[PDB]
Structure 1
Amino acid sequence: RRTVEKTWKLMDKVVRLCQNPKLQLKNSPPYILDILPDTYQHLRLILSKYAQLSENEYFKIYIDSLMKKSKRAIRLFKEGKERMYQDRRNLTKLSLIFSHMLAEIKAIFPNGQFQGDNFRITKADAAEFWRKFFGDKTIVPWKVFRQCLHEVHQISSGLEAMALKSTIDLTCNDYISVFEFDIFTRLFQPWGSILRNWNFLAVTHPGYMAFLTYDEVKARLQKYSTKPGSYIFRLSCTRLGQWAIGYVTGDGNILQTIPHNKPLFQALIDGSREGFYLYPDGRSYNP
């Protein structure tokens, strides 16, 4: 708790810094003004229930992530000055990453207790991969993983690795827990063509907006009312491991679907067929 008294303390400076009126935070997911507070409430849940907690390696890496994370914001509010109303956009990249650190600690410690030992990963192939390789593990550094990842699904170049590090390392801490893992496995399934989809999808596809809000997505496709068929897809902070599809109707309107649990790969392949998905990001060509 010694360092976490130092962890919360840092987090309060930050919620202290954000609450500034000159910031006009339009708290639309994520709400840096809630995720952070909620993150504390849970640490109380977690610390309530628990030296066994002390040796938890993920807890250590995690709180390390949180604080390392906390001070950067402040430092940010420092460097930035007036700019505070690229240093800003950075702020958002963060409230985002905190949003995820939220979800993960929530997932590894449900109701307040450690259950990483038993995370049930959604896709099976996916699960045997990790079990086989990591088995008992809950968190794994980046290099290690990539290496194993590599024994099965070869990674074309140092460039692409990091780019993938980028897509799997949410919390941004150079480690990959079963969670950051379990989400990405569900995002880019099926397990066999793992890296194949990812590349075709979130790397060269004009239709991959990464994280976005339902208001922004609409916002963007308001520039295509004129052309129904135009669509784009995204991830969601409020529901990680999930893609939602936005597109414009022959009614001129803008609709939003979320596949239940059919991959994006097919969805788009099909929706494009009923002539639903035809001009990725209002762009002529569509793969």
Structure 2
Amino acid sequence: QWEEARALGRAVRMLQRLEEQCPPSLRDLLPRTAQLLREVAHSRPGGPGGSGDFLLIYLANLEAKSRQVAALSRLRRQLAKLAIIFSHMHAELHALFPGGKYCGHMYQLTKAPAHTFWRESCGARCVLPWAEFESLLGTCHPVEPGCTALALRTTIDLTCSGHVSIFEFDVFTRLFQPWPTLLKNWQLLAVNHPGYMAFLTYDEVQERLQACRDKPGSYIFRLSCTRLGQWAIGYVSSDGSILQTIPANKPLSQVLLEGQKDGFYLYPDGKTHNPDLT
């Protein structure tokens, strides 16, 4: 209430400080996040998992990750990773508090069945702890206990807070549509497919595909910080030049099958074996 206002205040001063101490770049993200937080502070509880609980979890997590950055190739390997995480935290804040104003209670998921699943399972809540989320999901899509779950957390919990927000669920269900085979799609595209690069930049995809330039049909697919919930495919055309496609709001496996049948997507990461997706 006033606890929230105070924690909002601490957060912004903490970000300004972290900025002094310094794509996706922390120099661009830090002040953007600080500005959004002042707008949030200015515009300002809900039930459990409402705007208040969300802010509390968000601010603790922002704090924890800020300490990790402050206490800092393999140094650059870990700064890059923290930088992606801050990008993710800025996007989540932006989606649930556009212009500082909480919209979590009426936020609309892009895929209709994902929408229905979330609102029927969580009601007005915009955020849920991993354990509850995993359990609720499991009533609809069997999640195997053990290591599968760890890989699934990494895919879904973008902000690495141990909580899944409605935004992260939206991102995940867009990427791995259609709903009826949700986890199966995730398993085929993100666990078992050598074409999958997770988060890359355009430049990194270019760099990666250089060694495949004399092999047209070589391709890869990646996620993008500033375009959460969509794919990009990098591929070698017959000319040997690296092009990028952004697939429509439609299943990735369909785009890849159609591109396999056209001769564009044949060699994931240069490799000869192209997984059967039929």
Residue 156 of structure 1 and its aligned partner are, at CA, apart by 2.2
Bigger mean CA deviation after superposition, 3-12 or 225-234: 3-12
The alignment partner of 1:276 has SS state of coil
Matches within 5 A, 1:89-238: 89-238=77-226
Identical residues among aligned pairs (%): 51
CA distance in 2, matches of 1:208, 1:273: 19
1:17 positional shift: 2.1
CA contact (8 A) 1:117 1:137 kept: yes
Q: Which amino acid aligns with 1:13?
A: R
Deviation at 1:131, TM superposition (A): 1.2
- Secondary structure of 2:105's aligned partner: helix
* 2:174 counterpart SS class: helix
Q: TM-score, normalised on structure 1? A: 0.90
Provide Cα deviations, 1:28-87, integer angstroms capped at 9, x if missing partner. Answer: 2x12101110101111111111278x9711011111111112112112x2xxxxxxx823
2:32 maps to 1:42: no
Q: Does 1:255 align with 2:243?
A: yes
Please name the residue that 1:264 is paired with. Answer: 252
Whole-angstrom distance in 2 between the partners of 1:214 and 1:282: 17
Cα distance in 1, alignment partners of residues 9 and 125 from structure 2: 28
Counterpart CA distance in 2 for 1:137 and 1:198 is 25
2:51–2:102 contact (8 Å) kept in structure 1: no
1:10 touches 1:71 (CA, 8 Å); kept in 2? no
> Could you report, residue by residue, the CA deviation over 1:126-155 in whole angstroms, capped at 9, with x for unpaired residues?
111111111211100000010011111111
What SS is found at the alignment partner of 1:157?
A: coil
Q: Give the match for residue 25 of structure 1.
A: none
Gaps of 5+ in 2: none
Aligned partner letter, 1:58: F
RMSD: 1.7
For 2:240 and 2:157, locate their aligned partners in 1 and report how far apart those are by CA, in whole Å.
38
1:63 corresponds in structure 2 to: 59
Measure, in 2, the Cα distance between the counterparts of 1:55 and 1:220: 41
Deviation track 1:171-211 (CA, whole Å, cap 9, x = no partner) reads: 11000010000000000000110000101110110000000
CA distance in 2, matches of 1:252, 1:68: 45
Number of residues of Structure 1 aligned to a counterpart in Structure 2: 269
Quote how far apart the aligned CAs of 1:163 are. 0.9
- Matches of 2:9 and 2:111 in 1, distance apart? 38
Indicate yes or no: 2:7 matched with 1:3. Answer: yes
Whether contact under 8 Å (1:7, 1:63) holds in the other structure is yes
Aligned residues of 2:129 and 2:164 also touching (Cα < 8 A): yes
Instruction: Go from structure 1 to structure 2 and tell me whether the alpha carbon gap of 1:7 and 1:114 turns closer, same or farther (over 3 Å shift).
Output: same
The one-letter amino acid of 1:155's match is: V
| Partners of 2:152 and 2:171 in 1: CA distance | 13
1:222-241 deviation line (CA, Å, top 9, x unaligned) = 11111100000000001100
Assess if the C-alpha contact under 8 Å between 1:230 and 1:247 holds in 2. yes
> Residue 249 and residue 155 in structure 1: after superposition, are their counterparts in 2 closer, same or farther (change >3 A)?
same
Give the stretch that moved more between structures: 6-15 or 231-240. Answer: 6-15
Unaligned runs of 5+ in 1: 19-27, 78-84
TM-score (norm 2): 0.93
- Residue 14 of structure 2 aligns with an amino acid whose one-letter code is L
Report if the CA contact (8 A) 2:196-2:221 is conserved: yes
Listed one character per residue, the Cα deviations across residues 1-39 of structure 1 (whole Å, up to 9, x for unaligned) are: 323332223223322222xxxxxxxxx2x1210111010
SS of structure 2 residue aligned to 1:251: coil
1:48 aligned partner, one-letter code: H
SS at match of 2:233: strand
